[PDB]
């Protein structure tokens, strides 16, 4: 199989750059349209991260920063599969996450929210998907938190995630939420996404059969990246 270029990103399945509902976007969105280009090796290539560099607890946010004891909060496991738009599993892709603690507080002097800090929680993790595009990490369920869009704006609970896979064109950063969270319906950031079906694509589903008794709950969340088309005739990529 000789691979061609990645399928075109469907701009309609993504939030526009200018979304007045999300205020900060008003001054950080280009006024000019994005210039689409035909892909070259620069776009279809991406870096490789060796597993040797990853620590044993990089994907365990419950323990990778616990000092005296355990972080306070809901013990949850999150797993899922990373596939490309054509169903192919994405192997050895770097998945990085960051989140707030159970109070909705981020570990940084910038975050002045009254929600309490947890001395045993960092809020950062990372992993490499396996040969089946499978990923799994453990953490504390992040709490929602206020922010100033409109003075009383509140982000539903969420975990920020980033992916670097096989092609630079696949580079993606997003946020996933937890099923049932009522703040999901009122979030200006989540509402920057045009379709209802795409909004729901960011909701991790409770995976009850995979709860670990007397220990942790589990959420299932799958991620889909852009995929490459195969070439059977002219190969103009080069």
């Amino acid at each position: 199989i000789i691979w061609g270029a990645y399928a075109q990103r469907n701009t309609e399945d993504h939030p526009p750059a200018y979304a007045p509902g999300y205020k900060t976007s008003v001054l950080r969105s280009p006024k000019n349209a994005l210039i689409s280009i035909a892909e070259t090796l620069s776009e279809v290539t991406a870096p490789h991260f060796s597993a040797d560099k990853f620590g044993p607890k990089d994907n365990d946010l419950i323990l990778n920063y616990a000092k005296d004891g355990l972080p306070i909060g809901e013990r949850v496991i999150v797993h899922g599969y990373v596939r490309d738009q054509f169903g192919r599993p994405v192997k050895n892709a770097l998945v990085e996450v960051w989140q707030a603690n159970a109070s909705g507080r981020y570990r940084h002097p910038n975050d002045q929210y009254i929600g309490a800090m947890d001395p045993n929680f960092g809020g950062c993790g990372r992993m490499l998907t396996d040969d089946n595009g499978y990923y799994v990490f453990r953490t504390i369920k992040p709490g929602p938190y206020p922010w100033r869009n409109r003075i009383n704006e509140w982000r539903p609970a969420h975990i920020h995630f980033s992916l670097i896979a096989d092609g630079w064109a696949q580079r993606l950063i997003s946020q996933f939420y937890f099923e049932g969270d009522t703040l999901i319906d009122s979030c200006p950031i989540l509402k920057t996404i045009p379709s209802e079906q795409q909004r729901r694509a960011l909701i991790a589903l409770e995976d009850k059969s995979n709860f670990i008794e007397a220990d942790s709950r589990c959420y299932r969340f799958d991620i889909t990246l852009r995929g490459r088309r195969a070439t059977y005739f002219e190969n103009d990529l080069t």
Partner: protein, 202 residues
């Protein structure tokens, strides 16, 4: 067929969650940074720096930047590279950084990339792919950094020539400077307004 997972802003803490070490969060033993140069890396070292300004002309101090480039011979340290040429074994080609919370300047210590093949037997001028993430940015903004001392090559570059507004092509060309003995390329990114940097949908 499935739809791509919808993008969302990196948020106000993206430059913290993806660079924990620099936010005093020592969770990882091996941390990713903005230094793509290893002792045995080939090519001439260069420093790429600049600022990102919003629609008011103010530098963003919460931006996260990543770059992707080829080695000194124009080969990508990627299995997807089909040039049949060997790549510099001591080069990751990727780097990540944020801006100084005060000054607002971001930078990378890397090598000047060699020319990479373009589509249909063409040749691309040396460039570095760069992406911008930050609060208020719903989808990572893609752009390219070309070098002004490569005027001859940039003139024949396919991507630069695909931009019909010749006047905007220059927003993608960084300026060479020499601080003592080090070569520095200044590249300022303007997200909105006059001389707005060209952004690509790759």
């Amino acid at each position: 067929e499935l739809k791509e997972t919808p993008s969302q802003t990196g948020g106000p803490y993206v430059h913290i969650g993806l660079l924990p070490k620099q936010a005093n969060i020592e969770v990882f033993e091996h941390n990713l940074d903005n230094n793509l140069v290893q002792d045995n890396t080939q090519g001439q070292r260069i420093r790429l720096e600049g600022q990102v300004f919003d629609g008011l002309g103010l530098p963003l101090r919460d931006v996260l930047i990543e770059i992707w480039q080829a080695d000194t011979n124009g080969v990508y340290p990627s299995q997807a590279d089909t040039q049949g040429k060997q790549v510099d074994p001591n080069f990751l080609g990727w780097g990540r950084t944020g801006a100084d919370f005060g000054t607002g300047f971001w930078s990378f210590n890397t090598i000047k990339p060699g020319a990479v093949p373009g589509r249909k037997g063409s040749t691309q001028a040396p460039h570095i792919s760069l992406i911008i993430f930050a609060r208020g940015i719903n989808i990572g903004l893609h752009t390219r950094v070309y070098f002004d001392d490569e005027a001859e090559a940039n003139a024949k570059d396919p991507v630069l020539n695909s931009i019909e507004w010749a006047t905007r092509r220059q927003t993608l060309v960084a300026k060479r400077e020499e601080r003592d003995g080090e070569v520095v390329y200044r590249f300022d990114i303007r997200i909105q307004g006059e001389n707005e940097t060209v952004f690509f949908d790759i």
